[PDB]
Design a protein around this nucleic acid. Structure first.
Length: 54
RNA sequence: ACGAGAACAUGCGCGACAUUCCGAAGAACGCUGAAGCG
């Protein structure tokens, strides 16, 4: 009953590389860099559900 | 010097005519590219 559409395409301006920092009671730089959507971005999906189940 | 002697169970003729192997039917149901962080 739950359906999620794929998102509307994300503008490339909203993509940037971030570095992941593990925190085991202290910040620790690590060889993690990933392409991520920058904060403040709005993403649009279309959701269809039935009244009975959800 | 046989109820006998001759004497083709034969001739012309199509197993043929009319016919949809179709009718109904979602290859889809569920499923985070993610977990640990050395």
């Amino acid at each position: 009953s739950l359906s999620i559409s794929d998102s509307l395409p994300i503008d490339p301006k909203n993509l940037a590389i971030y570095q992941k920092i593990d925190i085991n009671k202290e910040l620790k730089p690590m060889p993690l860099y990933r392409e991520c959507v920058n904060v403040g971005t709005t993403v649009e999906f279309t959701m269809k559900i039935n009244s009975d189940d959800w």
